[PDB]
Amino acid sequence: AYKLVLIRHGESAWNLENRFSGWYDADLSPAGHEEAKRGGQALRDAGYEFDICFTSVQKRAIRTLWTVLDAIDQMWLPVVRTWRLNERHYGGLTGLNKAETAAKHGEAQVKIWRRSYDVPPPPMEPDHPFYSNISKDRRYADLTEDQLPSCESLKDTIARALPFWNEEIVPQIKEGKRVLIAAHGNSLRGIVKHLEGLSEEAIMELNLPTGIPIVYELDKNLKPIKPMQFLGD
């Protein structure tokens, strides 16, 4: 059976993972970096070998990948980065903590957003402190108008992640390349939902742990032959 490993990055600076970090390019905190080290060491202890790596264009994921590759002595592997594996774009909520979000929008609406599969947050407007920082970042300069989000529902996030999965990652897996993916909660949710055929409600209830290698064994049709497995202790 094919083997696929996913890893979700850990903690980012300034408590940004509890502040809808989204497309803001927050770095790992020292603790998130250590999480990645422990994941890498788990993969090393278990003797894992990869042939190709995929990650987003966000430095907290990239640095997670770097840390893992360092730990397993496979810094020489080919690495492919794509905005399509980015975290969900949280629009105008980006950077806000829970209290600020509730104060600005009300508990009713926040409940609706938190439980909805295809309702996006409000768009990130020009007066948002991250607006030019993100929308005019030259790493997205080749994106067309529809491609560069101002906000995303979970449905949107999964919709732009899965074409990369199908077009770039799947052919590698079917060639027998051992794939490592270092990415984010919601883009990885897209992949997991596709792999396991999960419902919208199920994927919204699924919370992937951070810094832990997530192992899939896939058959010839890229269907898991058993539940996802975690490496470490």
Add this chain to the structure above:
Amino acid sequence: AAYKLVLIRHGESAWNLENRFSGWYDADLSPAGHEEAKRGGQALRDAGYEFDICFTSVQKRAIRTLWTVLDAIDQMWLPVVRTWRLNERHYGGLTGLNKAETAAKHGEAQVKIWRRSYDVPPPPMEPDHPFYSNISKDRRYADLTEDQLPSCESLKDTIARALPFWNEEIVPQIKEGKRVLIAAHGNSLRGIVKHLEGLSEEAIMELNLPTGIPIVYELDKNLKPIKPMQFLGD
């Protein structure tokens, strides 16, 4: 000029401190070499440099140099391409030996012949060499054909396998308008510099590229330098 190319040679490795021939052995940076890379990266950051694509070898002292620079200039998101063709020169049977061991075994005379030669290789790395399986059987070279995987290299050999990557993969990116950064090794970079400047064999053998410092070329549309290489920093 039309194009800008930046080269960087990695700094001190753990085996440099041991005075040992590394070649294709995958020695890591020393702390000092890592700091060198940080200073180079900061020089590129201070000068506002932007890149569109990066090339490096499959050796971690170069790769980690690249990572350090990308971190410093906040461009960790750039596409990166790794290739064995940018590896350090393969030092064959000398690999793993220090200065003393090499002179003791071969004589400073024979070492004279090797280091002053453009096209005399060191002896081959044989199956009984202590690093033979560590290097020759490393799965990162699994796709090399039999003729491609060196047992040893003269500088001529090194340049001969580096320049095809330059011509076939890097040049087209430059003419596409991509701003290229190459993080690699003394001898593979020598290959590139020799091609760019049309240098003689003796000239390239007398050229010693400084480490950890961004090397800037301004190139015309035919990739001819319009002025000498420049070093970035203070």
